[PDB]
Amino acid sequence: GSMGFKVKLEKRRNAINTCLCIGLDPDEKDIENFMKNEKENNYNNIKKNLKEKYINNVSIKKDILLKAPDNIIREEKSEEFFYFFNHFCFYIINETNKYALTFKMNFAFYIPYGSVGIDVLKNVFDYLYELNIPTILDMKINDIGNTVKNYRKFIFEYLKSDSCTVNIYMGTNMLKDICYDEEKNKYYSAFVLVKTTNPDSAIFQKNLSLDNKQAYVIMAQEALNMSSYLNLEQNNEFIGFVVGANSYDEMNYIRTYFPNCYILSPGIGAQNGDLHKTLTNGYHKSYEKILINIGRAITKNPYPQKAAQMYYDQINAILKQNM
Amino acid sequence: SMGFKVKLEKRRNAINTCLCIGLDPDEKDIENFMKNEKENNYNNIKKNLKEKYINNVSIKKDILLKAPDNIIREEKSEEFFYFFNHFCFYIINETNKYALTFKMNFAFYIPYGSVGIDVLKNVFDYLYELNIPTILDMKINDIGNTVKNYRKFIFEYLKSDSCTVNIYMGTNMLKDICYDEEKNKYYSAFVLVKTTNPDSAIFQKNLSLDNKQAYVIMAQEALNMSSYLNLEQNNEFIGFVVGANSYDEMNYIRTYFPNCYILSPGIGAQNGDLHKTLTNGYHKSYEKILINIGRAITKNPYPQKAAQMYYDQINAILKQNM
Ligand SMILES: *c1cc(=O)[nH]c(=O)n1[C@@H]1O[C@H](COP(=O)(O)O)[C@@H](O)[C@H]1O
Numbered sequence: 001g002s003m004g005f006k007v008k009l010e011k012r013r014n015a016i017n018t019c020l021c022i023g024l025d026p027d028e029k030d031i032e033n034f035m036k037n038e039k040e041n042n043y044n045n046i047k048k049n050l051k052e053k054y055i056n057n058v059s060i061k062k063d064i065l066l067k068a069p070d071n072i073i074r075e076e077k078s079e080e081f082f083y084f085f086n087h088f089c090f091y092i093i094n095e096t097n098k099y100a101l102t103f104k105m106n107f108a109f110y111i112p113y114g115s116v117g118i119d120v121l122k123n124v125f126d127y128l129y130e131l132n133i134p135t136i137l138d139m140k141i142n143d144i145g146n147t148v149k150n151y152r153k154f155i156f157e158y159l160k161s162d163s164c165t166v167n168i169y170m171g172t173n174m175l176k177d178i179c180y181d182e183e184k185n186k187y188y189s190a191f192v193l194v195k196t197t198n199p200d201s202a203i204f205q206k207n208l209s210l211d212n213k214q215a216y217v218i219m220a221q222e223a224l225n226m227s228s229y230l231n232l233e234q235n236n237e238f239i240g241f242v243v244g245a246n247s248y249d250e251m252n253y254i255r256t257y258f259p260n261c262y263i264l265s266p267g268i269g270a271q272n273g274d275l276h277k278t279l280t281n282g283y284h285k286s287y288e289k290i291l292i293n294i295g296r297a298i299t300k301n302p303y304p305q306k307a308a309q310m311y312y313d314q315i316n317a318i319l320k321q322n323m
Numbered sequence: 324s325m326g327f328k329v330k331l332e333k334r335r336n337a338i339n340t341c342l343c344i345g346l347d348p349d350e351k352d353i354e355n356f357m358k359n360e361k362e363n364n365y366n367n368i369k370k371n372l373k374e375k376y377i378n379n380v381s382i383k384k385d386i387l388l389k390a391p392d393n394i395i396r397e398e399k400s401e402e403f404f405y406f407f408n409h410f411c412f413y414i415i416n417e418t419n420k421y422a423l424t425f426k427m428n429f430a431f432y433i434p435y436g437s438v439g440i441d442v443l444k445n446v447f448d449y450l451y452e453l454n455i456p457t458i459l460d461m462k463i464n465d466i467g468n469t470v471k472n473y474r475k476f477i478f479e480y481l482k483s484d485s486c487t488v489n490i491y492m493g494t495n496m497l498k499d500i501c502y503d504e505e506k507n508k509y510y511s512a513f514v515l516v517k518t519t520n521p522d523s524a525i526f527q528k529n530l531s532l533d534n535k536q537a538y539v540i541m542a543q544e545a546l547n548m549s550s551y552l553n554l555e556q557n558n559e560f561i562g563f564v565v566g567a568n569s570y571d572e573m574n575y576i577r578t579y580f581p582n583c584y585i586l587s588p589g590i591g592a593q594n595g596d597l598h599k600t601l602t603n604g605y606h607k608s609y610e611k612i613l614i615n616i617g618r619a620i621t622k623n624p625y626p627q628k629a630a631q632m633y634y635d636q637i638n639a640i641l642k643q644n645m
């Protein structure tokens with residue numbers, strides 16, 4: 001893993017020929033359903049997880065993770081939730097990774113049980129790192145410089161994430177303490193929020209303006225200005241933009257006015273975005289520049305390998321059309 | 324269980340301040356506590372051990388209750404957990420008598436992985452036992468389905484009284500942060516309005532709508548959402564984060580939203596001016612202007628005295644405004 005995110009994404013894209021970003025946002029029902037299904041089926045999927053060589057290379061509680069499932073429930077009741085949570089994530093990754101340009105894990109899904117889910121998240125990032133699959137930590141972080149450097153450490157040193165999401169409403173100077181580490185002279189990549197998928201996203205992103213430009217345009221320009229100041233792209237890193245898969249006019253504007261920007265686009269599947277429109281409006285011939293994120297539509301499907309294949313094939317068909 | 328509004332008003336009646344003590348321990352603070360404690364025969368850990376509510380923390384209590392020499396020899400893997408939690412307990416023990424509320428910034432508790440989240444849980448349990456109003460400062464923002472997870476973590480797991488939120492994505496997220504329809508539960512939040520970072524003008528002031536700077540638009544929309552959720556009827560509220568270094572905005576906000584709740588960081592380490600901030604943001608229900616002080620207390624070698632001086636100063640200024 002000795003290459004910048006820009007180069008890592010380019011190589012993978014060249015290898016697997018897609019821009020599918022698979023979202024791994026397991027909720028409590030997903031974990032419970034997994035536990036239930038595995039008990040009913042002789043734990044087939046966990047046994048398959050246990051086969052995989054890199055499972056021996058994760059950091060946290062291997063002594064538990066590598067135990068036989070029927071042992072967990074019988075002798076390790078307190079470690080049960082950790083075990084089934086972690087094995088669910090490993091299962092999704094094992095089934096879908098061959099279709100994924102990148103995986104994006106949203107931090108919110110890993111925190112609500114306290115420390116246990118952060119052990120899971122750490123093992124998920126360790127695992128993806130070993131598989132050499134590009135990663136995004138979706139955490140829409142924001143704070144003053146002194147405070148955000150703690151997120152930089154968590155995300156880029158502890159998890160060894162390739163990138164993260166950031167909300168720059170507080171200002172762009174925070175990026176100096178996220179995309180750059182002055183002590184180590186390391187650079188990192190991020191996606192800043194530009195236009196989001198929530199139904200009332202226009203209220204600030206579009207209604208606020210300076211002169212005749214809407215906030216989302218100003219914010220995108222300011223992010224880019226900070227990327228140039230930081231020399232990110234000279235260091236094979238970048239600041240890109242989050243633009244929702246339902247925001248078809250904004251996607252078109254962003255791609256038109258910032259031709260070579262990297263775009264991360266959530267909102268397909270569960271949130272009902274239009275894939276043809278989104279992919280067409282954000283298209284770049286280096287299509288790692290238009291990451292299409294699909295979470296629940298893959299992870300909540302009874303056969304996530306087949307779900308990921310469907311989206312992979314659907315995307316590639318639209319990619320072929322754009323040519 | 325009466326609501327944050329009531330908790331704040333009642334604590335203010337008991338202690339007569341609006342000091343909010345920030346508990347943001349960094350690695351150097353934990354390491355420096357560990358060093359000091361060794362050099363003074365664990366004077367402060369010994370004191371921590373003699374307090375009643377240590378016996379009520381949820382996570383690894385046995386470990387916390389052990390003597391420091393028994394940890395260092397027999398539980399070395401728990402050493403960092405032990406010293407991190409005991410630094411937090413020490414600050415709380417030395418300063419809580421002066422605090423209207425404690426604010427913990429999440430960022431300080433995550434960068435070592437899970438260990439600091441167990442610490443954070445124990446901290447919130449300890450504060451809850453002492454009846455001290457709490458704020459989790461995490462500046463959350465996401466789509467509704469996602470932020471429900473932060474509602475659970477913050478308000479069900481930590482049992483925080485409130486949190487901070489960034490509503491730049493939109494205000495609708497607040498329905499899944501300050502309200503739980505299924506359980507009929509209501510919670511309080513402070514939204515970012517004007518922040519302390521040097522370049523905060525870039526979007527907060529330079530963007531506008533109608534004839535008003537963005538920070539005013541955002542404050543108004545947050546209040547619109549608060550009334551839609553009927554928080555104040557359930558003794559909760561949506562309040563504003565306004566920097567202690569942002570006098571014009573504080574003045575504008577206090578003038579145009581007369582009865583709003585304001586959280587004001589930026590005094591001490593970030594150089595705000597306590598007198599101007601407190602005058603410009605003043606309200607006679609002064610739990611409505613919480614002055615946050617983090618590093619100027621936690622990085623002071625005599626933190627009880629540092630809290631005391633802020634308390635005394637706030638009180639003399641609160642006297643001036645009558
Ligand atoms: C972040 C920003 C945004 O505008 N929209 C979003 O949905 N998100 C995050 O992206 C993921 C969507 O997943 P799904 O709808 O495919 O399940 C999720 O992590 C959300 O927080």
Ligand SMILES: *c1cc(=O)[nH]c(=O)n1[C@@H]1O[C@H](COP(=O)(O)O)[C@@H](O)[C@H]1O
Pocket residue numbers: 143144147345347428460517518519520564566588589590591592593615616617618619
């Ligand atoms: C949040 C928003 C803001 O505008 N300014 C801030 O400083 N913060 C947070 O408040 C705390 C300040 O602590 P200190 O400067 O007294 O140490 C800290 O948690 C920061 O993230």
